[PDB]
């Protein structure tokens, strides 16, 4: 959950130089991003999620 004591820090992306294109080329484009765990990753204390509910 959001917790200051166990906060993880900051992910960010910047332009190091700039995107350069020739003529006849789109000047804007998308990047997509993916996240995954490494082999040293684990979880514990099973609990219910808030990502689903059943009101009534």
């Amino acid at each position: 959950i959001d917790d200051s004591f166990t906060e993880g820090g900051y992910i960010s992306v910047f332009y190091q130089t700039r995107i350069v294109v020739p003529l006849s080329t789109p000047r804007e484009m998308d990047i997509l991003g993916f996240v995954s765990a490494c082999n040293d990753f684990s979880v514990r204390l099973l609990r219910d999620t808030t990502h689903i509910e059943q009101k009534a």
């Binding site: 490494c38 082999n39 040293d40 684990s42 979880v43 099973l46 990502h51 689903i52």
Partner: protein
């Protein structure tokens, strides 16, 4: 031979690098995830890793009883105009949402099923009459067997159907059932129909629901109060808890992201916006 409670890999110390080896550069088009570890892109120290994935094994993730239904029954005065209420429930994990969502991280599963029954009762009319301790009969009626039409008809004999006679105020009832599927695994999703519509046959005749296989997949539980009618009416509820023991699962799926809407994968208008506002450059 690697077990769920084994410690994960140690971090090996690694130093500076300047080479043609390019772990950081990859190409997700291939369909693969880049298998990197911190020593691939930063300098690391040696750490002896003690953490394990024991609690996220498939067994441990599911090793909890979840409520799948609440059955209502009663036992009224004999003089009532309304019939004594007995309950009939079609066995399923889809009447509630939490266990359903967990199982649906996967396409198929195999497991032995543990059912635990919690039973509570109360008075309804602002009376002062009492009731003696109730015994409940929970009868499993598999597809094909006669479903009870009255709280006291011949089917409650149970010569062959399994029944639990539960005594009120005693420990919650519990039974186990083997993997009973007619397939080699339970299908959490069936992309098909139970009937082929033929041209030579009417549309009504060839029709069937999308994604539905056996109409009566697993049969029903029928529950009654065995005690005869009592001057003061008592209403009871039987809460059913399902735990998948000895479980195996196949083919992972993205979890349900918008509210369930029926036994299928259908969704309701107005529930399709799970995500909330957050600005691209705001932490």
């Amino acid at each position: 031979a690697a077990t769920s409670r084994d410690a994960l890999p140690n971090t090996e110390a690694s130093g500076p690098t300047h080479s043609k080896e390019i772990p950081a550069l990859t190409a997700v088009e291939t369909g693969a995830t880049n298998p990197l570890v911190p020593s691939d892109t930063v300098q690391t120290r040696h750490v002896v890793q003690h953490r394990s994935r024991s609690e996220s094994s498939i067994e441990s993730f599911f090793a909890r009883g979840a409520c799948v239904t609440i059955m209502t029954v009663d036992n009224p005065a004999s003089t009532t105009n309304k019939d004594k209420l007995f309950a009939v429930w079609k066995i399923t994990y889809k009447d509630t949402v939490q266990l359903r969502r967990k199982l649906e991280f996967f396409t198929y599963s195999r497991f032995d099923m543990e059912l635990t029954f919690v039973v509570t009762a109360n008075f309804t009319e602002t009376n002062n009459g009492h009731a003696l301790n109730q015994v409940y009969q929970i009868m499993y009626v598999p597809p094909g067997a006669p479903v009870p039409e009255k709280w006291d008809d011949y089917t409650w004999q149970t010569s062959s159907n399994p029944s639990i006679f539960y005594t009120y105020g005693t420990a919650p009832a519990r039974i186990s059932v083997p993997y009973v599927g007619i397939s080699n695994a339970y299908s959490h999703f069936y992309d098909g129909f139970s009937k082929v519509p033929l041209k030579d046959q009417s549309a009504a005749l060839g029709d069937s629901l999308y994604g539905a296989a056996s109409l009566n997949d697993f049969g029903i539980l029928a529950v009654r109060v065995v005690n005869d009618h009592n001057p003061t009416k008592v209403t009871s509820k039987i809460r059913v808890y399902l735990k998948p023991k000895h479980i195996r699962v196949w083919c992972p799926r993205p979890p349900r992201a918008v509210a369930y809407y029926g036994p299928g994968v259908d969704y309701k208008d107005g529930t399709l916006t799970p995500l909330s506002t957050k600005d691209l450059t705001t932490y």
